[PDB]
């Protein structure tokens, strides 16, 4: 006889359906078909079925609606009985995993020999929620990646200036972003962009 699962968590990508995962538990040599119920306060959505390839993950068939508390729970059943996991409710806007800012470019200035200007393009989520960034840079020959303090990049923007890089060296940059309040998941690192300071 199997036992109830746990470790339930759900993640929402940019403009896609919400997937959820759980744990397998102990093995009982008996076939088990997993299913999780998702419902609003008034609307009862469809159900998943644990595929034979991956019995701990499904992709729902309904479009995601933000700012609406949805209640999700998994019910495990077999030939010997059924049992339901715990019930949690969460705003789907708190589980969003945005995309990395694309089109990164580095432009210098012919007036000062210690500054660099960073430009990028934010995804479409910037219109829904406020987001923050983390700007990491390093020298061309130095493999260690330094990080700019996040206190300067705690709001949405599309430009930033680096400082204190005096003599004629090349630098590579990268940036990621997530929700402002820290709730959610950090995006992937953007493409590395190079730039040479002024002489």
């Amino acid at each position: 006889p199997p036992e109830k699962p746990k470790n339930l968590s759900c993640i929402v990508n940019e403009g896609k359906k919400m997937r959820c995962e759980w744990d397998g538990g102990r093995e009982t040599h008996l076939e088990t078909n997993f299913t999780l119920k998702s419902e609003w306060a008034t609307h009862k959505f469809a159900d998943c079925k644990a595929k034979r390839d991956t019995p701990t993950s499904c992709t729902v068939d309904y479009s995601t609606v933000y700012f609406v508390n949805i209640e999700v729970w998994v019910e495990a059943e077999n030939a010997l009985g059924k049992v339901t996991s715990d019930h949690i409710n969460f705003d789907p806007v708190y589980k969003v995993k945005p995309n990395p800012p694309h089109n990164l470019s580095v432009i210098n200035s012919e007036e000062l020999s210690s500054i660099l200007k960073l430009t990028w393009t934010n995804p479409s989520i910037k219109s829904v929620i406020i987001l923050k960034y983390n700007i990491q840079y390093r020298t061309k020959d130095a493999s260690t990646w330094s990080q700019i303090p996040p206190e300067d990049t705690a709001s949405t923007r599309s430009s930033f200036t680096v400082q204190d890089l005096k003599p004629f060296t090349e630098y590579v940059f990268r940036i990621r972003c997530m929700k402002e309040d820290g709730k959610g998941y950090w995006s992937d690192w953007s493409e590395e962009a190079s730039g040479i300071t002024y002489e």
């Binding site: 306060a41 609307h43 309904y62 700012f67 609406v68 409710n89």
Partner: protein, 172 residues
């Protein structure tokens, strides 16, 4: 089983309502895809897409309404909008048709995403109300203009309801 109220926090509920209205207030999101898909992307033709008087309630009436009749009229108007939007979606073309023509599927995606947005807004209005607890035949060219005017009126109503929600900040 299923909870009667989806949440019990007045503050986060009001925040969700305000964010929903401010998001659904997007003419560029809803109306413009319709004008683009119906072939009316010509300046003079787009100039005639104006709301007719008496289509949706007025800002003065929404301001005069209280906290219960306001939610009731909002629910009724959303129901009527859902009906007319189902009619429109029945009238809209298909994805392969749009591909063969040269239009953008993003319009169909935005419509099929805007309908569940209305459903969720109705759900949230129900949650807030529970938490409180105190033309025989028309022409093929006239139908397009009627739909455009209806969408413009809906956008005006969304702006009005968003301003009304943003008016009352916090209360017990």
């Amino acid at each position: 089983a299923a909870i009667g109220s989806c949440s019990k926090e007045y503050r986060v509920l009001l925040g969700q309502l305000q964010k929903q209205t401010d998001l659904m207030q997007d003419t560029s999101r809803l109306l413009d895809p319709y004008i683009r898909i119906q072939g009316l992307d010509v300046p003079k033709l787009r100039e005639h897409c104006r709301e007719r008087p008496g289509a949706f309630p007025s800002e003065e009436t929404l301001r005069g309404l209280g906290r219960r009749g306001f939610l009731q009229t909002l629910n009724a108007t959303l129901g009527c909008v859902l009906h007319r939007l189902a009619d429109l979606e029945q009238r809209l073309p298909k994805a392969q048709d749009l591909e063969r023509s040269g239009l953008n599927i993003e319009d169909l995606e935005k419509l099929q995403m805007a309908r569940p947005n209305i459903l969720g807004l109705r759900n949230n209005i129900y949650c807030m109300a529970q938490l409180l607890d105190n033309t025989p035949a028309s022409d093929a060219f006239q139908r397009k203009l009627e739909g455009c005017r209806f969408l413009h009126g809906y956008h005006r109503f969304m702006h009005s309801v968003g301003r009304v929600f943003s008016k009352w900040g916090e209360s017990p």
